[PDB]
Every structure is written in structure tokens, then in C-alpha cells.
Design a protein around this ligand. Structure first.
Ligand SMILES: *[C@@H]1O[C@H](CO)[C@@H](O)[C@H](O)[C@H]1NC(C)=O
Ligand SMILES: *[C@@H]1O[C@H](CO)[C@@H](O)[C@H](O)[C@H]1NC(C)=O
Ligand SMILES: *[C@@H]1O[C@H](CO)[C@@H](O)[C@H](O)[C@H]1NC(C)=O
Ligand SMILES: *[C@@H]1O[C@H](CO)[C@@H](O)[C@H](O)[C@H]1NC(C)=O
Lengths: 528, 532
């Protein structure tokens, strides 16, 4: 039968689900690893032990143990990102949507959630795969991975808490797709990994890492790349934070094994309560437990792998939003609110830059401040607010992504670049926040196609053309069916706007600020 | 008789000169110091000792010994700045223009020429003082001072060549005006010193130096201020260039005394032939022999004096031209010519920034480059040309002057700031050069009044209102006439920072002149170089 699929680890039973007057198959909460619980906390994932009889794949799995945002209780714009299922350390499951009737060997897209390596769930209303699966006739998989200490506690040298285990969760999920997706009508030789933020960074990390390269064909990175300043740390800093996590919980610090056993007897949420304490600075867009440059998952530094072309050579499709930084200013920077226009005094601007570039010395801070202050109108609260906004977005997302795209295009086989700047009509966040971090996701996932979601007709046209670009790219390495999204080349450097207006081609996305962040500031910081 | 005047130093006989179908008195080439020749080369000047009989003050004196520009031989554009009289070390003379008939006790303006402290003469056609003095009813003086080595060789510690003597030359001329200008109808209580470029720097230096303060009432600085990067050197760097001047001339370097003795035996042209060789780098807008921060003429660092208010407190009027830099790029940076549009390659842009900011480390160079490059359009020859044009101007003239004006205003009694941005209709330099260093001077001295010079009618009006501002300012401390109906040049205030444009259009008032770049030059870049 259509809903009963036989896989290499045992039988699973999906459920036929309705999509836009019509139906498809959904296989929810399929296990791909053993539950990383008890002794397995912090350890690499192990392949799920095969089961007998029929796994009930009709409802969403548990979400990983994470920090839960409660700045704005009841509020849909903050809550749409929080766990919608019970949280549990037993959380390594994947979900699949297959068009009905089951295609023969079709394009596979694997979704990887963001949330800064400290949160995220595969089960969010915004990641509901039915629309994209139905509309574009693809098999859609959303995986999961451990976040926070559980995913990224790094005590390098240990084999009990090596670090990177969350990236290995993702790799184990891709391995499973490699092994099993053929049984769902998926073509294991035509899988595109894609994800946003910590997920676009994760995608890029699998492009780098020798052990992941063979588990997929192509890649899409939305608003994140592997070289993001927040997306990794050294072995030393990982060890430092992990120790400091032990110290916070009055752990025996005498050795790695005592630290680890101590950290393993704590309740999940005892670890989260102190998670933010291990950071080195008062900071914004900085997360405690993240990937490590370990010599294993990553053979060398990210930079040197980019330069020597030590990475998967394929097509990539990637881009950014217009106001990446506004979510993080609202949450951690003085002067901003959800219920006001958020004009930023000169005083709050300065403390805003220190928060934003927390590794900078005072010369670096002056540099950033000068680069983003209009000195004719320095007391202008709106220019201060927009300037802070651009600092956060240029430094944390846009410029790192541009650095990556320039490095990659030099060795890859097809770059496609977008700048998404459509402000959704039904947005519940205030105008000042602009085109926000994550808000392209709704369109990628087909949500403007659902009538009661109260979107405009041309928002449904835009999401249709995004979905169609995304899946056509997934299928062929080219978002264009043969108006044309051109290749980004190292000479011409073209990208497109993604909004409701007809398509415009531009060149050198934010070159001026990105030379400052990618070339001049690193140089000044290295020198002083 | 108007023409024969008795000064404290001896009698003097002027000459009647025609001006604009009228006439006035001119006393040319009056000595104010002993000829600094022989064992007095490099020495502090000495008062002209009195003479008997009548000094013929009817022709222009000699020009001081200087490098003579010959990049464009016969070209009026460059040649107007060359000495127009025989050069001689015997050159310390002053000129006076006095309205006819002689005023009872009127406003006095003393002109201090520029030319980088290495050149200049009081006798150029562009400094003809007859039109200003005639038109504004002022007593107009032009002084001279020793330039290059002869005026600034600085061997701190020695009293034979202590440095700054060109500036002391200037002081003696002012002391003489103080003493004798009452005899020409001048009021020694109402003298304004004004000059352009090294001239403007000098004026600011007299504002700062305690020994000069009491010799004038008020000051106008044109395209130059004391704290300009090219206007002064440490004693260390001054001594170094002095010793290297010797090394070039094959001199006994065992001691200052032998060094000085050797230098005193060279003919002037020999000193000048090697003048440029003592600079520390390949540069543009750097000059070998300039004032030193010595602890005497300037008590402490110029910066510390500015911050502490250790300066004469008075009114000042000052400003800059739009394209200060173009002259110096033309003469010294790759890719520029006076016969083309001077579109600059990116290669030539980089080597142009190195030449323009020669003291900067590699990181400093990157910052300048980043600050003036449009990275959407980096191979644009027009934008590279203009960026380089702004770099030289912003670093060397405008931002220094802005620093001075902001610091000064904190303590002074009236600031008036201007932006001269009129490109003369009759200009012989190419259009890419724009509003050039020095070209406000012909307007200040009233040359457009003379029909044969073929300026437009609106240029004459511009010259007439510029002269009136300057002299009204000299008269009262404010360029605006009381209870006039004409548009009003507002005070620069530290909160508000207003300035006007100076051109043929009606007056625009603006605020914070070149703030964005001047924050880079005055705050950010100095922090960066001082990190190493
Ligand atoms: C699977 O689980 C759901 C709800 O937890 C239940 O309604 C459904 O019947 C289950 N399937 C079977 C056949 O056990
Ligand atoms: C991709 O690779 C093939 C051969 O290896 C080459 O012919 C093709 O042009 C490449 N495409 C791009 C756009 O790099
Ligand atoms: C002064 O010199 C000039 C020019 O040579 C001459 O016209 C004038 O008569 C001279 N005066 C006297 C009295 O010698
Ligand atoms: C100049 O000084 C006088 C008295 O000391 C003062 O009243 C006047 O306001 C000052 N003018 C300015 C513009 O600073």
C-alpha cells in the first residue's frame, strides 16, 4: 500500500494528509538514530536499531531540548519559532512528504532548521512540507539535530563529548535519506539540502566537510554561511565554555571524564538555565554551543578550505534578507521595542555597536561607528536605528555570506544569488523591523498559498515563483526553466531582487560595507 | 607732500601709481631688517639699522632665494607664482599702498604670501595692492620673509641656525608696522594680518606664538592653518633634514658649528639644488624647510596650545577653495596632465594615495583607500581622479583648517568661515583642476576690476563683495556691514558650524563643512596610526 513503506530499518506507516483541496502522503517522526540519552548525552549519534512490526509515522515527534523564548507570551511572531511539541532528549527523528500518487524517482529536498545552533524544531507550522511537496512534485524531508550543550558541547580530545555531534545528527539523517529515500519515490542521487540561518550555515558545513559531501547533490543556503562569526568556535573556546558550563553547575572540574559524568547527571533544563552564562562577552547574535574547528569534521580552518577549494564542487543557490539584524536588536540592544518606532539616541547607538561587534577593540569600534554614522545628522534617531540594524546584518549574515559566495564561485559549478526584500503585508512585527530574519521561510514553504493565512494574491505569486525556483534548482542545478536569474560570476557578480515587483538584476551585493567587514576590519583587528 | 614720509628708521620716498582711472601712493621695497647675508644666513633677523637721506621707495625689491618652478616654461598659469624680480639673499623688504589723500588713521591689512615655506614673493602681479587699498580705503602692507633653508634650517640647540627665522622675519615686519604705520595714515591698533597657504599657516602661527600676539588686532587665514601636516616639523626631524642637507653638500658633520659654517659658504643656488633631497619619503604636498616646534616661538605642541586656549583671542575669518589638491596631483602624482582629463587608473590611484599620505603605515593606506573608493565603480577614471583630488585637499588643507576652526572657536571672539567654489571664466588651467589652490587671491586683490583682464561682470561683483567682506572684517571684526540690506554671513558657532559659499550665485548658508571626511582625517586616522 501507498502509506506502508518498507525501509532498511523496518516498516513505517504514514498518513494521507489534505493540501489545498487535494491530498498527499506524510511520514512523520521516523527515527534515524538511537535516542541520545543517558550515557549517550554529548556522544556521536548511533544509527537507529531496526525494529519489528510497524512504526506509527502519523504524528510529529518531540522537539529537542532547548531554551524557550518568552519575551512575548501569546505573541505569534515570537511563538511561531518555539517548540510546538513536548521537548525531550529523545528527539532525533525525520519527517517526509511524498506526493500522491508516489512518484518514481523524483527530486529530494532536505530541510535543515535554524535557531542559532541553540534552538529550532522540524515541526513548526512554517516548515510544514505539504505545500512545497504537492505544488512542486518533490519529496520533502525535514530532519532534526541536537542543539545547545546537547548538540555542541565540545571537549576536544574526549570521545565522550567531542563536539559537533549535532552536525553528525544531520549527517546521520542525510545518510538515512541516502539509504532509504528510494523507497518513498525519492532519488538518492538528486537530493538538495537546504536550510536557513544556523541551517544555512549547516548546509555550508556539509559542503565543506569530507564526510558529508557524498550524501547530497546540491545545496541552498538561506541567510547563513559556514564562515559566520557566530557559527563556529576554536577547540580552545569550546573547551573554555564547556568548563565554564561545569563551573556554573558546581561540577567536578578535575578532568574531562568527571566534568562529563557530572554534566550527564543534570536535568536537561538545568543545563539550559545556565547556557547563556558561558559566553565571553555582553553580546548580540552570539550563541554558546556551536560547531568547532576540530580537525575532523573540518580538516582545516574554514578560510583555508575555501581558498584551496577543499569542498564539494556543485551548484549552490543562496541569499539574504534586507533586515537580518532587527530581530537581535529588539532582543538584546538598548532602545528598541516591538511597540514603538525605536528611535535610537546617540548613546544607545554606541552601546549597540559594542554589543554587535563584541570581539572588537576600541579602534575597531570606532571604525564600525564611523562607517555607519552620517556625521551631518548624527543625532537622527531613525538613522541611528537603521544603522545599527545594518551593522548587525552586514556583520553577522550578509558580508559572511558574500565572502563565502565569492570564495565558492571560484571553484564551484554554478552560483545563484538573491536578495529577498518583500515586506509581508500580514506581518505582526512592527514596520521598523523591515524584512526580518526568517520571514522568507513562509514563501519558500508555500504558506501564502493558503487562503485563510490572509496574504495578498501577489504574495501567492511570489511564493509560487520562489518555490518553483527552489525546486527547479533542486532538480537541475538551475532555478530557470529553459525572465532569467543569471549566474553569479566572479567577474560580473549578478544577483536578483525577490519581491512582488518584476525581476531586477543588480551587481556586487553590498560591496561597500562588505569590503569593510571582509577585508578592512579583520586587518585592523589583526594589527592592533 | 604725500610721498615723503619720515619713519623711525629714516626717510622714505614713494611714488604715485594709477589705479582704475584714479591714483594712489605706493611705497615699495622699504627695508625692515638688516640683509641676512654672510655670517647672518640662518640667524634670527636684525632690525634695519637707520639710514640717512632719502630711501627711494619707488620700485619693487628683490625676491628671496627660492626654487623656481619650470615644469611649464612660458605658461602663465605656473609662471605667475615665480619670482618676477632678481633673487637675492638681501630680500627683507616691505611694500605699502596708501590712499590719496592720506587718511588720518585708518584700517591696516598686512599680506603674508604663501608658497609652502619654500617659495613666494611679495611682488607678484596677483598681490598688487593698489586695487584693494584704493577700493576699500585701507592702508595695505606686503611683507617678505626668508623661505626654504635660508628661512627654516633648524638645528635646535644652536643659536646660529635655531629655526623659525622666516617666522621671525615676519614678526619684524609686523613690529615695523606697529612702529611706523601711523606715519602712513595707518592705525597700528587696527591691523589685520592675512595670507594664503603657507601664508595662512603663518597667520595662525602668529595667533599662537606669544611673541607675535600683540602685533596685530585680527586675522584672515586663506587655505592654510598652523596645524597643517606640511607646515611644521619636530626638532628631531628638522635637525635630521638640516644634517642631510649637509651630507648632500659634502659637509663636515662632526658638529653644528662646522655644519653651519660649511652651509654658510655655499652659494644660494647650491642649497636650493639639493633642497628636495632631504624629505623623508616620496611625497606630494611636503616641503623640506618649514617651521619647527621648538619650545620658544611655539611654547608647546600646537595641539596642546589649541586645546588649552593658549592663543590670541580675537576675531578670525577663514576658509578654503573647493579643489585644494589638484595643483599638487598635477605636479607630482602619476596619470595627471594639464593637457587631458586626467582620468586615473586604479593602479595610479593606489600609488597616488601612497604619495599623498606618505607617513601612513599599510593599514592607514587601506583606510584612506577604502574611505574614498566607490566599490561599485572602482575602475572609474573620473571618480579616481576626483577622489585623489579630495584626499590631497581634505588631508592637507580642509580638515586641518576645520580642526583649527572648531578648536579656535571654543575660545575666540568671532569666527567667519567660507567655502570659495568659483571657477574663473578666464582660467588657463584645465577644467579637471576645478577651483584651484591660490585662485581666490585674484578676487581678494580685486583683479577682476581691471577690464583688460577680461573677467565677467559678475566676477567683478564677486571681487567687489569679497574685498568688502575682508576689509569690513579688518575694520570691525565682522564682514557684514551694520544695518545693511545685503545677505548676512553668519558667525561660525561651535554648536551650529555655519559657513557660506563664495561665488557668483546668491548666498547659500551651510553647516559642518566636510564633516564626514574630516572626522576621518582628524579623529579616526590619527587613532589608527598611533596604534601601530
Ligand atoms: C498512531 O498514533 C495516533 C495518535 O497518537 C493514533 O490516533 C493512530 O491510530 C496510531 N496508529 C495506529 C494504527 O496505532
Ligand atoms: C560545470 O562543469 C562542467 C564540466 O566539468 C562544465 O562544462 C560546465 O560548464 C560547468 N558549469 C559552470 C557554470 O561552472
Ligand atoms: C628712484 O628710482 C626710479 C627708477 O629708477 C626713478 O624714476 C626715480 O627718479 C628715483 N628717484 C630719485 C630721487 O633718485
Ligand atoms: C566678544 O567679547 C565681548 C566682551 O568680552 C562679548 O560681550 C562678545 O559677546 C564677544 N563676541 C563673541 C561673538 O564672542
Amino acid at each position: 500500500s501507498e502509506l506502508l513503506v518498507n525501509t532498511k530499518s523496518g516498516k513505517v506507516m504514514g498518513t494521507r494528509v489534505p493540501v489545498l483541496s487535494s491530498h498527499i502522503s506524510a511520514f512523520l517522526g521516523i527515527p534515524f538514530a538511537e535516542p541520545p540519552v543517558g550515557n549517550m548525552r554529548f556522544r556521536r549519534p548511533e544509527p537507529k536499531k531496526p525494529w519489528s512490526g510497524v512504526w506509527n509515522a502519523s504524528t510529529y515527534p518531540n522537539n529537542c531540548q532547548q531554551y524557550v523564548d518568552e519575551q512575548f507570551p501569546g505573541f505569534s511572531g515570537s511563538e511561531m519559532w518555539n517548540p510546538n511539541r513536548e521537548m525531550s532528549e529523545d528527539c532525533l527523528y525525520l519527517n517526509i512528504w511524498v506526493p500522491s500518487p508516489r512518484p518514481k524517482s523524483t527530486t529530494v529536498m532536505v530541510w535543515i532548521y535554524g535557531g542559532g545552533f541553540y534552538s529550532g524544531s522540524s515541526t513548526l507550522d512554517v516548515y510544514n512540507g505539504k505545500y512545497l511537496a504537492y505544488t512542486e512534485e518533490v519529496v520533502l524531508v525535514s530532519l532534526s539535530y541536537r542543539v545547545g550543550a546537547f548538540g555542541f558541547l565540545a571537549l576536544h580530545g574526549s570521545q565522550e563529548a567531542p563536539g559537533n555531534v549535532g552536525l553528525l545528527d544531520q549527517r546521520m539523517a542525510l545518510q538515512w535519506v541516502h539509504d532509504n529515500i528510494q523507497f518513498f519515490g525519492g532519488d538518492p542521487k538528486t537530493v538538495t539540502i537546504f536550510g536557513e540561518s544556523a541551517g544555512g550555515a549547516s548546509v555550508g558545513m556539509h559542503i565543506l566537510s569530507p564526510g558529508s559531501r557524498d550524501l547530497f547533490r546540491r545545496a541552498i543556503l538561506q541567510s547563513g554561511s559556514p564562515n559566520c562569526p557566530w557559527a563556529s568556535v576554536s577547540v580552545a573556546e569550546g573547551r573554555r565554555r564547556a568548563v565554564e558550563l561545569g563551573r556554573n553547575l558546581n561540577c567536578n572540574l578535575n578532568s574531562d571524564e568527571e566534568l562529563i559524568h557530572c554534566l550527564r547527571e543534570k536535568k536537561p533544563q538545568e543545563l539550559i538555565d545556565v547556557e547563556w552564562n558561558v559566553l565571553p562577552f555582553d553580546s548580540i547574535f552570539r550563541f554558546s554551543f556551536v560547531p568547532v574547528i576540530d580537525g575532523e569534521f573540518f580538516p582545516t580552518s574554514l578560510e583555508s578550505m575555501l581558498n584551496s577549494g577543499n569542498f564539494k564542487k556543485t551548484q549552490i543557490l543562496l541569499g539574504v534578507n534586507k533586515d537580518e539584524g532587527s530581530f537581535f536588536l529588539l532582543y538584546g540592544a538598548p532602545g528598541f521595542s516591538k511597540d514603538s518606532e525605536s528611535k535610537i539616541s546617540r548613546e544607545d547607538f554606541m552601546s549597540g555597536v559594542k554589543l554587535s561587534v563584541p570581539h572588537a577593540n576600541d579602534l575597531g569600534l570606532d571604525a564600525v561607528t564611523l562607517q555607519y554614522t552620517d556625521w551631518m545628522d548624527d543625532n537622527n534617531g531613525i538613522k541611528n536605528r537603521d544603522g545599527l540594524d545594518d551593522i548587525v546584518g552586514d556583520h553577522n549574515v550578509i558580508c559572511p555570506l558574500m565572502h563565502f559566495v565569492n570564495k565558492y564561485t571560484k571553484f564551484g559549478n554554478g552560483t545563484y544569488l538573491y536578495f529577498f526584500n518583500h515586506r509581508a503585508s500580514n506581518l505582526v512585527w512592527p514596520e521598523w523591523m523591515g524584512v526580518i530574519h526568517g520571514y522568507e521561510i513562509e514563501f519558500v514553504f508555500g504558506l501564502p498559498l493558503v487562503k485563510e493565512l490572509n496574504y495578498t494574491a501577489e504574495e501567492e505569486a511570489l511564493s509560487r515563483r520562489i518555490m518553483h525556483y527552489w525546486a527547479t534548482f533542486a532538480k537541475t542545478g538551475n532555478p530557470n526553466e529553459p525572465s532569467k536569474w543569471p549566474l553569479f560570476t566572479t567577474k560580473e557578480q549578478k544577483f536578483i531582487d525577490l519581491n512582488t515587483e518584476p525581476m531586477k538584476v543588480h551587481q556586487r551585493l553590498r560591496v561597500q560595507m562588505c569590503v569593510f567587514w571582509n577585508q578592512f576590519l579583520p586587518k585592523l583587528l589583526n594589527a592592533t
